[PDB]
Write a protein that binds this ligand. Structure first.
Ligand SMILES: CC(=O)N[C@H]1[C@H](O[C@H]2[C@@H](O)[C@@H](NC(C)=O)[C@H](O[C@H]3[C@H](O)[C@H]4N=C(N(C)C)O[C@H]4[C@@H]3CO)O[C@@H]2CO)O[C@H](CO)[C@@H](O)[C@H]1O
Ligand SMILES: CC(=O)N[C@H]1[C@H](O[C@H]2[C@@H](O)[C@@H](NC(C)=O)[C@H](O[C@H]3[C@H](O)[C@H]4N=C(N(C)C)O[C@H]4[C@@H]3CO)O[C@@H]2CO)O[C@H](CO)[C@@H](O)[C@H]1O
Lengths: 497, 496
C-alpha cells in the first residue's frame, strides 16, 4: 500500500490576511509553489491552524479575514485536480493555541468534557470541513492529560462517527473524510496519555508522531533534535513512560522503558508499537523541514553534545541575531530556528559552516567552528534512512513540519516521495548503522516463548520458566508454590504460540 | 499504654492427648510452668493450633481428645485469676496446616470464598471461642494468595462484626474480645497481600509480624534468622514488594522498595509503616524463642554468611542428628531447630559452642569450630534492642513463638516484660548501632516538610518542591506546567 506523505502547511493569520503570491517578504511560501507535479508527491496537506473558541467550537482565529482564508484554502483544494488521492486536511491546535499555557487551552479542555460539548464541538468540525472544502480533520492538541484523556477519546470517536456519516451522505466512498491527530514524539509529553494510546488511535486513520524537537536550546546539552537511532556519546533522559498509570510491576516498567535512554525517532516509534492495539500502519513518522540553532558551543566534536549559551525562553529575549547568514531569523526575530530553505542558502553562502554527519543518529548538522555555532536539522540524506525505517517497520508513512519551510524547488518533499515511489531509487543496500535501537519490551509486545506448562503443587526455583494461560512466566525468586498470574512471584515474559 | 506481650503456646495433639504436668518426657512444657508471676508478664497467650476442617469451619485437630483439650485450655484461662488483663486467645492455622502445600490448605481457600462460607466460618470461630472459654481469635494462614485476599479480608471483617457483638452481649467492655493474625515478616510472603494491608489490618487489634525465619537451611548462605538491622557483609535479597499489585509508578516503587535489600526485622516493620492506614500501634514484632542450626559451615566469620551442607526439606530427610548436645533434636527428630531452653543447655554443657554476637544485626549466634556448626537465635540481649526499637517505633508490642521453648526460669519472657515495664530498667543509653536501616519511603511514612503552595499557571523546573492538597511534591523532570495530582511529573515526597 502507498505510504502516506502528510505535509502540514502553516500560514500565520497575518499572512492569510495579506496573502500574495508575488511578495516573498509577505508570504515566504505561497501555495503557488506547489505545482501539479509537487501535488502528486503528497497524499495529504494539513492546513494549520484552526482553533477552538470560547464557544467550544472549531473556528478560525477571529482576526482572520474570512474571504482571504477561503482563498488560501481554495488554492490548496485546487491541487486535488492534479492528484485524485490528495486530501486537504485542516489541523486544529498547534503549540501556541493548545499548550497548557496556550491562549486557547481551556477551550480544548472544556470542549471535550461532556457528551453535549463533544457533540457540539465535533459537529462544528464537520461544518468547518464542509464549509471550506477540507477532506478531513486533524487534531494537534499538545497535549491532553489526566482527566482530559477520556474526553479527548470520546471526542475523537464522536468526530469519527460524524465523518463516516458525512462520507456516506456525500457519497465520498472513493475518498472518505479522515480523522488524524499529531502525537507527541517524546516520552515526557507522551507519558500524559500513553496508557490510553489504543483508545486514542482507534478512531484515527493515522497518528502523526512529532518525532523532532527532541533537542533544543531549552536543554543544557546540544544534540540532534531528530536522531533516528541513538549515539552513546549523546545525552540520555529519564524515561517518563514509567510514570504512566499502566498498572505494571517494577520489572515490567523496567523492561518496557529502559532509562536513561536516547530520545530518538526510533524510540518514539517503538514506544508506540509496544502498546497492544496500536497498528504500525497508523503510525506516521514526523520529520522536520527546519533546524534548531545553538551558540556558545565548545569545539572538539562538531559542536555536538556541548554546553551552550543559548537562551531557552519564548519569545527570543535579545535582539542579537547570531546565526550567521540567517536573514530569515532577523525577519522572524529568532536566531534559534531556521527553515531548511534558509539553512541550505547558508551552506550555499560560504559563511563558514561545515556540513557534518553523524553515522549513528543518521542525521546532518552544521558546525561553525569560528563563531561556535551548532545547528541540528534534517535533509534529503537523513530522510533516506528514515524513509527506509518507515518501510522496514511498516509504518503508515511520513509526515513533516512544514511545507512552507522546503526550498523553492521542494527538494525535501520530492526526496520523500522519491524514496517511497521512485522506480529508479533503490535503498535495498542502504546500511542503517550501529546506532542504539530502542528495545523496551512491555506486556503488550511480548515475544513468543516456549516453556513446559505450569504444574500445580510444584515448587519452582528462581528463574524457572513455565507456560500458563497463554503466557510464559518466569519466577523472580525461589520456593514459589503459587500459580502464575495475579501473584507477584511470576513475571510474564512471553506469549504461548 | 502497656506494650502487648503476646506469647503463642504450641502443644501438639500428641501432648494434649497425653497431657500431664508431671513428666517432661511426655509434655516438656505443661501449663503449670506458667506461674502466677509469669502470667503477669504476659498480655496474651495464643493457644496453637486449631485448624479449618472440610466442613470449612474452625475446629480442633480431628484426632484430639476434646476432654483433654478443654482441661488444658481451662488451666490456661485459670491463669487469668492472676492477671485481669490476660487474654487466652487461640490461633487457627500454622505452617503445617495452612501453607500452600499443607494438609488443610484447601479449607482455608474455600472457607473464605463465599459470603455464606465466610459467614459460616466466622460463626464457627466465635462458637469455638465462647465454647472453650477463649478470649479472642487469631488467624495464622501462611498465607492467602493475591486472589484470596478480598475473601480473607471480608472474612476478618465478618469475624470482627460478630466479636464486637459478643463483647456487648457478654459485657466485656473492660476486656473486649480480640481479633489478630500472624502476618508475614518477610517481603516474599508479605508480597502476596501487601497491597491490601490497610483493609487487612483495619479489623484487627494487632497484626503479629512473624519477623523471624528470615534465614534457614533452605537458604544458600547461613545468616541471622531475625537480625534487627542489616549487616553489609551479610547476604541481601530481592525486594518482592516492588512486584506487588500496587499500581505505583516506577519512581514510587523504587523509593519504597530498594533492591536488593537486607531481610531484617526493621525492614519488615518499616515495610508495614510505609503503607497508609496501617497504624504502628497495631504492629507487633515477633521474636523467636528457638534457634536454627546449620552444619558444614566454614570459618572466618564465626559461621556467618557461609555456605553449608544442611538439608532444607521438611521433614528432616535423615536420621543423622548432628546438632551436638541437642537431645531435643533427637526426640523431635530434626537437628535444624532447638528451643532456646535446649540451646542454653548446650551452651552450659560445654560441648564446644561459642556464643558470638553481631553488633550490626544486634543478635547472638553459636559457632562450633570443631564440627562446623552455626546456630542463629535470639536471647535477652537481642531482646533489649528490639524492645527499644518497639518503643521508639511506637509499635503495639512484642509477640513470640513460642512459650514452651523458654527455659524453666522464663528468662526470655521475663526479659521482654522487664524491658517494657521494670521501673529499675533503663535503656536510654542503649546504642542501636550502625547496622543497616531499611530506607524505603511510602505513602504511609512520608516525612513532614514545608514547600511553597503550588501556583496555577507557574512553570516548574526539575526538582522543584510545592505544597498541594496537604502534601509536598517534587517534579521528576522540567517545564512542568500542570498541577500535582493531575500531571504525572509530580512525586508526592512529603506531608503537612
Ligand atoms: C504565535 C503564533 O501563533 N504564531 C507564530 C508562529 O508560531 C509557530 C512557530 O513557533 C512554529 N515553529 C516552527 C519551528 O515552525 C510552531 O510549530 C510547531 C507546531 O505548533 C506543532 N504542531 C506540529 N504539527 C506537526 C502539527 O508540529 C509542531 C511545530 C514545531 O515542530 O507553531 C507555532 C504556532 O503554534 O511563529 C512565527 C514565526 O516563528 C510567528 O510569526 C507567528 O506566526
Ligand atoms: C508438623 C506438625 O503439625 N506438628 C509438629 C510440629 O510442627 C510445628 C513446628 O514445625 C514449628 N516450628 C518451630 C520452629 O517451632 C512450627 O512453628 C511455626 C508455626 O507454624 C508458624 N506460626 C507462627 N505464629 C507466630 C503463629 O509462627 C510460625 C512458627 C515458626 O516460627 O509449627 C509447626 C506446626 O505448624 O513440630 C514438632 C517438633 O518438630 C513436632 O513434634 C510436631 O508437633
Amino acid at each position: 500500500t502507498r505510504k502516506a506523505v502528510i505535509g502540514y502547511y502553516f500560514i500565520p493569520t497575518n499572512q492569510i490576511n495579506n496573502y500574495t503570491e508575488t511578495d516573498t517578504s509577505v508570504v515566504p511560501f505561497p501555495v503557488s509553489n506547489i505545482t501539479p507535479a509537487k501535488a502528486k508527491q503528497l497524499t495529504h496537506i494539513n492546513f494549520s491552524f484552526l482553533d477552538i473558541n470560547s464557544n467550544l467550537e472549531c473556528a478560525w482565529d477571529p482576526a482572520t479575514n474570512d474571504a482571504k482564508a477561503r482563498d488560501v484554502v481554495n488554492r490548496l483544494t485546487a491541487l486535488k485536480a492534479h492528484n485524485p488521492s490528495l486530501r486537504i486536511m485542516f489541523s486544529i491546535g498547534g503549540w501556541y493555541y493548545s499548550n497548557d499555557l496556550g491562549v486557547s487551552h481551556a477551550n480544548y479542555v472544556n470542549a471535550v468534557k461532556t457528551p453535549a460539548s463533544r457533540a457540539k464541538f465535533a459537529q462544528s468540525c464537520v461544518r468547518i470541513m464542509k464549509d471550506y472544502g477540507f477532506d478531513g480533520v486533524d487534531i494537534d492538541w499538545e497535549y491532553p492529560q489526566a482527566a482530559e484523556v477520556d474526553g479527548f477519546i470520546a471526542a475523537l470517536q464522536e468526530i469519527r462517527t460524524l465523518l463516516n456519516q458525512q462520507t456516506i451522505t456525500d457519497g465520498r466512498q472513493a475518498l472518505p473524510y479522515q480523522l488524524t491527530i499529531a502525537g507527541a514524539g517524546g516520552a515526557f509529553f507522551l507519558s500524559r496519555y500513553y496508557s490510553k494510546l489504543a483508545q486514542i488511535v482507534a478512531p484515527l486513520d493515522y497518528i502523526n508522531l512529532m518525532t523532532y524537537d527532541l533537542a533544543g536550546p531549552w536543554e543544557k546539552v546540544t544534540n540532534h533534535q531528530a536522531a533516528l537511532f541513538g549515539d552513546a556519546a549523546g545525552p540520555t533522559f529519564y524515561n517518563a513512560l514509567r510514570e504512566a498509570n499502566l498498572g505494571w510491576s517494577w520489572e515490567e516498567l523496567t523492561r518496557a522503558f529502559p532509562s536513561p535512554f536516547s530520545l530518538t525517532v526510533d524510540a518514539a516509534v517503538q514506544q508506540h508499537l509496544m502498546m497492544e492495539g496500536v497498528p504500525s500502519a497508523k503510525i506516521v513518522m514526523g520529520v522536520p523541514f527546519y533546524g534548531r540553532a545553538f551558540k556558545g558551543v565548545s569545539g572538539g566534536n562538531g559542536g555536538q553534545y556541548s554546553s551552550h549559551s543559548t537562551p531557552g525562553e519564548d519569545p527570543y529575549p535579545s535582539t542579537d541575531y547570531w546565526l550567521v547568514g540567517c536573514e530569515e531569523c532577523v525577519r522572524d526575530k529568532d536566531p534559534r530556528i531556521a527553515s531548511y530553505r534558509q539553512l541550505e542558502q547558508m551552506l550555499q553562502g560560504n559563511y563558514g559552516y561545515q556540513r557534518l554527519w553523524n553515522d549513528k543518529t543518521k542525521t546532518p548538522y552544521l558546525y561553525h567552528a569560528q563563531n561556535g555555532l551548532f545547528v541540528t536539522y534534517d535533509d534529503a540524506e537523513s530522510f533516506k534512512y528514515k524513509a527506509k525505517y518507515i518501510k522496514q517497520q511498516q509504518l503508515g508513512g511520513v509526515m513533516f513540519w512544514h511545507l512552507g519551510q522546503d526550498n523553492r524547488n521542494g527538494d525535501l518533499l520530492a526526496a520523500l516521495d522519491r524514496y517511497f515511489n521512485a522506480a529508479d531509487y533503490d535503498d535495498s543496500q542502504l546500511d542503517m548503522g550501529t546506532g542504539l535501537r530502542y528495545t523496551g519490551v512491555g506486556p503488550g509486545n511480548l515475544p513468543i516463548m516456549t516453556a513446559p506448562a505450569y504444574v500445580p503443587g510444584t515448587t519452582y526455583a528462581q528463574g524457572a520458566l513455565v507456560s500458563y494461560q497463554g503466557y510464559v512466566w518466569q519466577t523472580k525468586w525461589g520456593y514459589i508454590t503459587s500459580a502464575p498470574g495475579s501473584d507477584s512471584a511470576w513475571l510474564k515474559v512471553g506469549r504461548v504460540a
